[PDB]
Design a protein around this nucleic acid. Structure first.
Lengths: 117, 108, 100, 189
RNA sequence: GGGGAUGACCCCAGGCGGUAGGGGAGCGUUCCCGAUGCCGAUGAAGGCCGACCCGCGAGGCGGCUGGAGGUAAGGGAAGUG
RNA sequence: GGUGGAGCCUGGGAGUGAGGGCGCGAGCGAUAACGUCCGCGUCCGAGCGCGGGAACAACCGAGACCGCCAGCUAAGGCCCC
RNA sequence: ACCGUGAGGGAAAGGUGAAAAGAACCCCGGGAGGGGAGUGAAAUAGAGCCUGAAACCGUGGGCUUACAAGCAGUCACGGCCCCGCAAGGGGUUGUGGCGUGCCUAUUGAAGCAUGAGCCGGCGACUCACGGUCGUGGGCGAGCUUAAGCCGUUGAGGCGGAG
């Protein structure tokens, strides 16, 4: 009939403890606010999980701009001649490379420039 | 290297601590003079601790004068739960807090 | 020795440094195997051409290992008396870049 | 069929329809339960300790909040009610049915009457040499109207009788030997 | 739903935010079986730490601790989380 | 009837039995109130959690099983933050 | 033990070791208490002396710290430090993005409404007899009392008012 839940609850708590990396001086061992602190941490990072890809959307968006603009035309334009496209449509790694191989991009820029005018 | 340690000490963990924090990672002799003419309580207690430490030291752990303190720390422990006036109702205690005294003697 | 292709997604900028890859339970299985991924990023030894110019040839890599969801924990919470939880899923077989 | 008569080399007898049949587990277990079930005992947490003393549930207004439940070493909460009807009485027909199909299971070894006479546990040693085995390890002692004396105490003692032996007895994973009027138990069956 | 061998596999349909609340299914916890079950001084347990398993409640496992246990591959029981 | 997937009866197990917010049609009410009263749609329900309108449940778009370094659009925006 | 004048209330405190062999002597010291030596299987087993975890205070190190907001953080990237599951992770963070705690009861909740200062152990839908619907299963007529007898284990069987 004995229910010495012991060893047990201690266990879980250390559990959440491990959940507990190092964070703010205090939830650091706050055997409770610890727990909570977690709860939020978590939902949070979830939110982060989907967010991220966007932040990137932008990220590229810019390295991007550095380049498209560099040559002499905005994303309105790029995107357009670009879509005139046909056997080629690619946006992500684009910029990355404007960086990575000057020419590669260059070229790209050209063909596109023309895509347009 | 060898050391000095005493529990069931009846003193200010804290204040005690300033004492040591100061005779600190420094010369045996020198700090010795530090406990010697330094103010506040413990001073004594501490200097004692040192004495036992270095004695302990060249006697059976062994080069007298090249020794200094290699580290020093105090740790609070068993309490002295003091029962004072009831809230002119419910007692109110205050704990004298026994203090643990530890110091390292090591040659140069 | 660096080319940029794409696969059931981008995952790309590769050559020989086997770049872990999405699931593809249909051709994988095939242990050390060769497989064709269509180009669209011929950037090689300082000469690049259109991705469609490409859309014709490409390459192959060697199907190489089975990667089991590198751990990542999901704590499902909301003040809203809502708590549930699960760990990752994602996984992928590694293939080494075979350039042509 | 194969109802092997002890005294080895000696004759054969027949397995009756009764035991024959095909088997009823859900029930078997039931039997079992029936068994330990009416057998157990019972427990309790002090009525007195639990609702004895005088509790002064400190009014209110004062900075607190209230012989009752939830502080310590007392109360219980919903304890080993010494007050809890331990029995479990399955049901006659049910039960005997049980000893029944179960025993069938046992058939899956034939105590030749003469044996009701052997007068020494070392003699047991003997019949033993006669048919030892791990199933033997199982070993269940059955005589048929008033026990096979000595047989009754050995590294496996017990001695049910042609009337009064049951699944409890041995349906429980074991293997055994009942004397022929024990087959009279059969009769019971 | 279309076959399923026990898995499982495949297609699409087909959604899958959720409190009171209603239905399924699992997890560890100290007990009674040791359903032709027993490990351990070269460690029982509990402790102390961890970039293999589980969706998970948990597992395993390896390291150090500490002195004596107790597990149950399966069902039963409940002062259970 | 294009539909597809709710529809009906029998029975066990339920919760809440007092919400409010908006648009519209009445009351009342100084056509006064993030007032209330009924009504017709939705809304919101401690997650109808994302977008936005600054920030703002909650009003316009929107249904959130799970994939960080993909792509097309809502509403709403594109001198700068 | 103790508050109560009184009637009355009514704690908390078990474990070292195999057995003391419990710690001569030497060492600092007013001493306690600390160091040696001896037991020893260990004494970070040492006398309130098994297993003695958390809270919390200390002592050394890595990193990090003075134009800066926030619990939190977490997504990105960088610098420095360790690579007992090495070309990948470990810890820490400068910056930058986005970000209102947790629980009750609420039309509605950061909450400035409540709840709760920290950690560890206690702690709350059960039992019994009725009845009920579901079902697993034994016969369809099905079924059992009180008892009598049988009992390492101690074995169930027989009882036919109802």
């Amino acid at each position: 009939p004995r229910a010495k839940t012991g060893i047990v609850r201690r266990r879980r708590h250390k559990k959440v403890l491990k959940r507990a990396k190092g964070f703010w001086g205090s939830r650091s061992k706050q055997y409770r606010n610890a727990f909570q602190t977690l709860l939020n941490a978590a939902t949070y990072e979830y939110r982060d999980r989907r967010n991220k890809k966007r932040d990137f959307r932008r990220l590229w968006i810019q390295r991007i701009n550095a380049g498209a603009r560099l040559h002499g035309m905005n994303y309105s334009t790029f995107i357009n001649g670009l879509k005139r496209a046909n056997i080629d449509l690619n946006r992500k790694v684009l910029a990355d490379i404007a960086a990575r191989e000057p020419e590669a991009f260059k070229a790209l820029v050209d063909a596109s420039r023309n895509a347009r005018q | 290297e060898a050391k000095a340690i005493a529990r069931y000490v009846r003193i200010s963990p804290r204040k005690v601590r300033l004492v040591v924090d100061l005779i600190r990672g420094k010369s045996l002799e020198e700090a010795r003079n530090i406990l010697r003419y330094t103010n506040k309580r413990g001073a004594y207690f501490v200097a004692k601790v040192l004495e036992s430490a270095a004695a302990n030291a060249v006697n059976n752990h062994d080069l007298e004068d090249r020794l200094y303190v290699k580290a020093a720390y105090v740790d609070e422990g068993p309490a002295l739960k003091r029962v004072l006036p009831r809230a002119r109702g419910r007692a109110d205690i205050i704990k004298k807090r026994t203090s643990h005294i530890t110091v390292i003697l090591g040659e140069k | 020795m660096f080319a940029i292709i794409q696969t059931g997604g981008k995952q790309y900028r590769v050559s020989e440094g086997d770049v872990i890859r999405v699931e593809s339970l249909q051709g994988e299985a095939g242990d050390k195997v060769e497989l064709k991924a269509l180009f669209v990023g011929g950037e090689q030894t300082v000469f690049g051409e259109d991705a469609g110019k490409y859309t014709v040839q490409a390459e192959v890599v060697e199907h190489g290992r089975g990667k089991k969801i590198y751990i990542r924990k999901y704590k499902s919470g909301v003040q809203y008396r809502r708590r549930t939880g699960h760990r990752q899923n994602f996984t992928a077989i590694k293939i080494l870049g075979i350039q042509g | 069929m194969e109802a092997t008569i002890y005294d080895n080399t000696d004759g054969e007898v027949d397995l009756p329809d009764v035991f024959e049949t095909p088997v009823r587990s859900d029930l078997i277990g039931k039997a079992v339960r029936a068994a330990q079930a009416n057998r157990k005992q019972d427990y309790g947490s002090d009525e007195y300790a639990g609702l004895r003393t005088p509790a002064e549930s400190f009014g209110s207004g004062r900075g607190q909040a209230h012989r009752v439940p939830q502080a310590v070493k007392g109360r219980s909460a919903h304890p080993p009610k010494t007050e809890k009807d331990r029995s479990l009485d399955l049901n006659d027909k049910e039960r005997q049915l049980a000893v029944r199909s179960a025993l069938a299971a046992t058939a899956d070894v034939v105590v030749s009457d003469d044996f009701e006479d052997l007068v020494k546990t070392q003699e047991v040693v003997s019949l033993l040499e006669a048919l030892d085995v791990h199933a033997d390890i199982d070993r269940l002692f059955v005589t048929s109207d008033e026990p096979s004396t000595a047989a009754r105490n050995l590294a496996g003692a017990d001695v049910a009788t042609a009337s009064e032996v049951n699944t409890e007895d041995l349906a429980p994973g074991r293997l055994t030997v009942f004397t022929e009027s024990a087959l009279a138990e059969v009769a019971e069956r």
